[PDB]
Amino acid sequence: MNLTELKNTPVSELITLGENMGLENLARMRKQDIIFAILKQHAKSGEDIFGDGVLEILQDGFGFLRSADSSYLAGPDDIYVSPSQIRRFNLRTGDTISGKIRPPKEGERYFALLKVNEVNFDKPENARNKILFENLTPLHANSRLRMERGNGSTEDLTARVLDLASPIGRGQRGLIVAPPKAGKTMLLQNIAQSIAYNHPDCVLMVLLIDERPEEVTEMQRLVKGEVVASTFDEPASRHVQVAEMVIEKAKRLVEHKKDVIILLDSITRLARAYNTVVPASGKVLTGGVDANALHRPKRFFGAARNVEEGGSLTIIATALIDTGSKMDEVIYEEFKGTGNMELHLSRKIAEKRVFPAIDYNRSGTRKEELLTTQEELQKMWILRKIIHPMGEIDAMEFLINKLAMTKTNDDFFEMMK
Template identity: 30%
Template structure:
């Protein structure tokens, strides 16, 4: 056997096509006979009546038959149609040419700015990062949002959820963070959004400044469940590529709930039995695999993940919200009551938590944060008594100080959509609030105290 001759001939050898045959279409799934490909393989269906062959992915098996979920509609597919294997490993091409672009789940441009010519294939399911390959989160990542930087300080490599019902400002908050963050690259996955909301987000929320250093992956609600799931995975893979180059990446997925709903549809179509509130077991198996992909490497860059979670009826205990809270490193709760009072961003600091805030903050910041949070908590506990005039001044020094400080704390927490808060100035203002509240405690009980609020120190970037 001449190995040198075999090696020389290999480039000219045509790969063998793996071809199966459609024998049934069941809902969203095409049943294919004689297609020995692994789960996750990409295929195309050779429909002669369509200009482009629809593509799909092997999602399971039923004996010798492969179950293929389509990336587009099943129009024109009939019994006996050939299904041809394309790639055994699902991937997306990634390069710096993606910056400032809007693409679909397959990496195809949607923005009309021309083709993306180069890219290194990045697997949608890369090898898992070992726990000892991860670095300890030690550095803060300023977001430009005062309420987050002061009370819920984010660390590079942290994963945090934004929990809210519809219409309380999730997307607007994401846009503010994307414009104001200190990260090198933003990767934004819009999963299951309404079609009309995508251009609104790009133009009005993200803006040209935010888009310039962002990559946006879109799968709207009218696309197939597989495209919605792949869009989330593609966003993760793109973020991992830039992290591998040593950059600090901000990954945003809006929303994890719609991603879970898409996976539920795939699971039910593949024959999974529904479990908690109709969600299949694969949903709860997939959530940690996706959310754990963010993080900081011991050697290299970081991915800081923001994941929005839709809560039905503002119920934070519904299955997806509950599962996500157990995986993430903290959560930001947007309050409908705050939104109804035109308090934006509608972040409720008492319901929200960042599990790494203390380890990325200095002592002065940590003490000031705890002091102001204690005042807010005291005020909320006494709210009903204050509303009906039943609270007796002097009964609780914290409440007395909180009553005087509350308007100034609220003013500190409010922020216009286009305002970017300077991180050092935010911390100084928080410490000023804490010092002012401390000075008020003796005078508040006597009713002689007055207070002036700190400067918030925001800047308005050009749009």
């Protein structure tokens, strides 16, 4: 039987079937431990077991199928796999493996993968024929990812400003340049809703780095997608491990020719974690950053590219400035040229409670002509020429007042005539 079907259900039901098939009182162990005990109890009845999870290859060659319960960490519910299959089906870190498994024998601690049935939502023998991620040629964003819902509620316009300030496409590299306390969480809420609504075909992934658990349980119950998180209550090692594993899953997925999008709050916190785990090189910069500490965060962010053969990988990260320490400033400094898509936010407007507090002229999109039509992009240029001589707060409030009347952005352009 499948593991996730027993992992998603509440613990009380697990206790019910546990005492149904004759087990102990199951109100004492952890939810992971209750899942593990139920799994062994149902497995000792001589039945074909199935499992699924993301592969993490160890130092010795063998691998472990981790589950999304603890953001794919070291756990007793991980499925041990021998290097023999890792060489036959040529699996790497980030490959979502699912197939028949068996229980751990005495002296063994983890389940063993016997039959593989599906590798990254594909046939396992097809996983042998593939090109590696560092091998395909990138490109610019061609297919437009319109984030407008079209219903025009009081928050739908929140996405329209994007289509009015910075268009987004497949394979783009986006980040938000925003001070603390601006409303980045709700803009990510709206953009995730827009991805789930307009383009539900692309893989919607949300990565949370060093944030409040309330935001975790809020996003994990709002969008219908894999939400992997890493709150502040965990060390930086776990954060960079999640970075490894999520970027590897995205790499394997785009190798499978799929459109994936990874949302990140925050990139400055991930940079802090990488600074925390990197060995000392002896060259520290202003703010407390090391010389060779930002290489891995730069890789993680710039993994975004548009694939020529098929698929795309998009990264939408958030950065913090006006925090008080030189560190986050230099983070935004050497990360300001790495991305090709910016959401500049103004705390100045957030003090006036005018949401969204987006800075129009400082924001933009790199090579945005390949996502829009000629006359549409000319409309964008005329709108920029209208907003530019105006101020900041007055221009933003004028934009929201002009969008409050219509719902679709093409209709707004039509009245803009």
